[PDB]
Amino acid sequence: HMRILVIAGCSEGFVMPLVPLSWALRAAGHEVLVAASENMGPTVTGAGLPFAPTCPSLDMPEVLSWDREGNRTTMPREEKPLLEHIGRGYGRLVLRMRDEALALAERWKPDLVLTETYSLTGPLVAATLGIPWIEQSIRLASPELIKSAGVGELAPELAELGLTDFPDPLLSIDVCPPSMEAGTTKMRYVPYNGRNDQVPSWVFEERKQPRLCLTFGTRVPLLLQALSQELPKLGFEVVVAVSDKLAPEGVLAAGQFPLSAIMPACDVVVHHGGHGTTLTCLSEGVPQVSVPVIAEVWDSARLLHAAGAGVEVPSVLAACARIRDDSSYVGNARRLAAEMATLPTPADIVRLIEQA
Amino acid sequence: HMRILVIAGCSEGFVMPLVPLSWALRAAGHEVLVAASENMGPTVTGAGLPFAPTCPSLDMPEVLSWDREGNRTTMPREEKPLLEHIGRGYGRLVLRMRDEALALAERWKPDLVLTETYSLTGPLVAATLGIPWIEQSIRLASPELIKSAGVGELAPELAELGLTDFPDPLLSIDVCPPSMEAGTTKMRYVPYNGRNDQVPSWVFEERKQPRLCLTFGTRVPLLLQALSQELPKLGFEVVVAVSDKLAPEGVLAAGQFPLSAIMPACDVVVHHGGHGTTLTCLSEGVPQVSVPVIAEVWDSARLLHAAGAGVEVPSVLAACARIRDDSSYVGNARRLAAEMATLPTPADIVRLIEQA
Numbered sequence: 001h002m003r004i005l006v007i008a009g010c011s012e013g014f015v016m017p018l019v020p021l022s023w024a025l026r027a028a029g030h031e032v033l034v035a036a037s038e039n040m041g042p043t044v045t046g047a048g049l050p051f052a053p054t055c056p057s058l059d060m061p062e063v064l065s066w067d068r069e070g071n072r073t074t075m076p077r078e079e080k081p082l083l084e085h086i087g088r089g090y091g092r093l094v095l096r097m098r099d100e101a102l103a104l105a106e107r108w109k110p111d112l113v114l115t116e117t118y119s120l121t122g123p124l125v126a127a128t129l130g131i132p133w134i135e136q137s138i139r140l141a142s143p144e145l146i147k148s149a150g151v152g153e154l155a156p157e158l159a160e161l162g163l164t165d166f167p168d169p170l171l172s173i174d175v176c177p178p179s180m181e182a183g184t185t186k187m188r189y190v191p192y193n194g195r196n197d198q199v200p201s202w203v204f205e206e207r208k209q210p211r212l213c214l215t216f217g218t219r220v221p222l223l224l225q226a227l228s229q230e231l232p233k234l235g236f237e238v239v240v241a242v243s244d245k246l247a248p249e250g251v252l253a254a255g256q257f258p259l260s261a262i263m264p265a266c267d268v269v270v271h272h273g274g275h276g277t278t279l280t281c282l283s284e285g286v287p288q289v290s291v292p293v294i295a296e297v298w299d300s301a302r303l304l305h306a307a308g309a310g311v312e313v314p315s316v317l318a319a320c321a322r323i324r325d326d327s328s329y330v331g332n333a334r335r336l337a338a339e340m341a342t343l344p345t346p347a348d349i350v351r352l353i354e355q356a
Numbered sequence: 357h358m359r360i361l362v363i364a365g366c367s368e369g370f371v372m373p374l375v376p377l378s379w380a381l382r383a384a385g386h387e388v389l390v391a392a393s394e395n396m397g398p399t400v401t402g403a404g405l406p407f408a409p410t411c412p413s414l415d416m417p418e419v420l421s422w423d424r425e426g427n428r429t430t431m432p433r434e435e436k437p438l439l440e441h442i443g444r445g446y447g448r449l450v451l452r453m454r455d456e457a458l459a460l461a462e463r464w465k466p467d468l469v470l471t472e473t474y475s476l477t478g479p480l481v482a483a484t485l486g487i488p489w490i491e492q493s494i495r496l497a498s499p500e501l502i503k504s505a506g507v508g509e510l511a512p513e514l515a516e517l518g519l520t521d522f523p524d525p526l527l528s529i530d531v532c533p534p535s536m537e538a539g540t541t542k543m544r545y546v547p548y549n550g551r552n553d554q555v556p557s558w559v560f561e562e563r564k565q566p567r568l569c570l571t572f573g574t575r576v577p578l579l580l581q582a583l584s585q586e587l588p589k590l591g592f593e594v595v596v597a598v599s600d601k602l603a604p605e606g607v608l609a610a611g612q613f614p615l616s617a618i619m620p621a622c623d624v625v626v627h628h629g630g631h632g633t634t635l636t637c638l639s640e641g642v643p644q645v646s647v648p649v650i651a652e653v654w655d656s657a658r659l660l661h662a663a664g665a666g667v668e669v670p671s672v673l674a675a676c677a678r679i680r681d682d683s684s685y686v687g688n689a690r691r692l693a694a695e696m697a698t699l700p701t702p703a704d705i706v707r708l709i710e711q712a
């Protein structure tokens with residue numbers, strides 16, 4: 001019987017993929033508490049998990065566009081220092097969370113910390129209290145250059161603990177299918193995509209024409225209205241998964257739909273290359289048209305395109321018809337979904353955590 | 357990899373205790389879908405689970421106060437036929453759910469049905485499709501007289517399938533601690549008590565006086581305001597767990613608080629003998645003052661009072677001071693909580709289900 005403090009990010013993409021393992025721990029009789037930014041409250045509790053805020057409402061651009069000195073930062077065009085730039089963003093994110101995250105850790109007294117790769121507040125809190133921690137990957141590929149830059153940015157905070165680098169996690173979890181990737185344990189990606197009123201009625205009824213899902217995530221929407229009007233002309237019934245506030249002919253519906261709920265009713269997905277969106281579409285064996293927006297998802301879209309599970313489009317109307325006609329995309333997507341199903345479940349991983 | 361259709365009731369007390377096992381299944385990589393009345397949507401999805409309505413908004417009194425003939429029914433004062441009366445209520449509840457629950461089962465095609473003891477729509481749907489089903493108990497004691505009456509009321513519906521009684525479930529789950537009770541597998545009761553914005557701040561900070569939790573559930577509130585004003589005079593800081601719409605001196609707070617989140621910050625609980633409330637307080641080793649309102653929870657309050665884990669009050673101010681001064685109540689409550697922790701987890705049960 002353990003008390004596990006789960007430390008998450010400031011947007012849905014950094015919180016949702018930690019939900020299945022958190023519930024897997026709770027299912028094993030353990031006490032779980034998810035600590036994240038105050039704006040991630042409804043997301044955490046909407047997943048049925050206990051929540052505690054570590055900082056006010058916060059989004060990544062606030063932290064990424066300003067450094068410790070207080071000076072505005074800009075993004076390098078060169079991919080490599082762009083990744084280091086992003087990494088330092090995650091590092092400074094820790095400076096906003098650590099205080100309340102530590103004080104919460106002092107009082108709640110956890111035995112173990114669960115967190116994602118770029119949420120470095122986890123390792124910091126774990127190292128501060130002198131307790132082990134678990135690292136779970138939430139990406140097809142996690143560029144270590146991002147992580148290293150974040151650790152380097154936190155150097156004054158580690159020296160405060162008389163450290164150079166965070167102590168290695170008790171378990172490093174990876175979710176990339178072996179037939180894709182270029183001290184880690186593999187885990188099957190069980191997708192959690194948020195909270196809806198109910199599973200849409202059209203999901204259960206029969207489908208008499210190819211259905212396409214169009215989604216850009218929770219950050220990229222703020223092109224979507226253009227692809228919505230044109231894609232049906234390619235011979236598709238389209239559904240747009242987007243925020244209800246953000247939410248038409250040939251379109252079936254437009255609104256907040258957890259992908260895992262609607263994926264069985266779809267044949268192809270056009271998206272922004274989002275980590276959670278990609279892995280979810282992968283796990284359900286659906287060919288994807290990935291339009292990689294954010295730099296940190298670039299590697300994942302490369303692994304995806306290479307395996308032929310989908311088409312990376314750095315035109316997207318052309319990529320769909322290319323999938324609508326060629327069947328090798330569906331085949332690979334299903335092959336990889338089948339491969340992920342063989343991997344250990346979050347339930348299997350809980351035992352490993354308990355056992356060592 | 358299975359598709360499990362979870363069939364629940366029409367009020368929170370019949371839905372919430374099915375959440376942990378449902379997530380335990382989802383954690384093991386299985387596909388889960390919770391089917392309940394339309395008013396139980398927010399409860400299901402608030403737990404992070406997929407939802408599908410089997411009937412419009414519905415509460416137990418509608419079904420219990422009217423029979424198949426369409427005639428108004430009254431409650432017997434004699435406990436025994438009162439239990440049979442209640443049982444026939446659950447039986448007629450099936451008549452309201454079975455249609456949409458069946459059609460949903462035809463299209464979604466589940467391999468297995470998960471349900472509670474008195475949700476007979478589960479067994480009916482399972483028997484109709486010819487698939488196994490799982491019975492989980494959500495009570496300290498489940499009077500078989502209730503269940504038998506429900507089955508008897510459904511006799512025309514079983515004869516429709518050429519049956520007399522529902523086929524025995526693949527697994528019958530019980531949650532009563534061995535040192536309490538008078539083809540079942542024991543499972544530890546992992547409490548899920550709903551959805552809140554966050555864990556209250558006072559839960560983590562230190563407590564310099566005995567704190568009491570006052571809650572009557574989701575049905576009984578519609579006395580609570582009286583016990584709220586008087587109980588602090590007994591030397592207590594009181595917190596009232598009740599609907600926010602329903603929600604003062606000596607009172608710390610009043611509103612919707614999932615018990616499992618606030619239980620560590622409490623010393624004693626006064627309640628309506630609610631099944632979920634009792635089991636949750638039990639699992640956290642907290643002495644209870646049970647005021648049994650509903651007839652079906654009477655047996656549970658008897659098992660509770662006998663074990664000395666609390667005081668059954670069929671005056672409640674006296675029962676608290678009796679617990680506030682005598683320490684044998686806390687001892688038994690903790691002994692039973694310790695006993696439940698030894699029992700197999702919902703995660704352990706998932707394996708059993710997978711294995712046989």
Ligand SMILES: Cc1cn([C@H]2C[C@H](O)[C@@H](COP(=O)(O)OP(=O)(O)O)O2)c(=O)[nH]c1=O
Pocket residue numbers: 011012013014016192193194215216217218219220240241242243255256257258259260273274275276277278280
């Ligand atoms: C807007 C929206 C998001 N989602 C989910 C899918 C993913 O799990 C998550 C999006 O995360 P992600 O795919 O990483 O993209 P991003 O981080 O840029 O937002 O939210 C839906 O399921 N339906 C929707 O309508």
Ligand SMILES: Cc1cn([C@H]2C[C@H](O)[C@@H](COP(=O)(O)OP(=O)(O)O)O2)c(=O)[nH]c1=O
Pocket residue numbers: 367368369370372548549550571572573574575576596597598599611612613614615616629630631632633634636
């Ligand atoms: C109103 C309320 C209910 N609950 C929970 C506790 C139980 O899990 C459930 C109540 O179910 P239960 O104890 O069976 O009582 P009833 O069926 O009469 O409603 O709801 C809270 O945790 N906090 C609250 O403020």
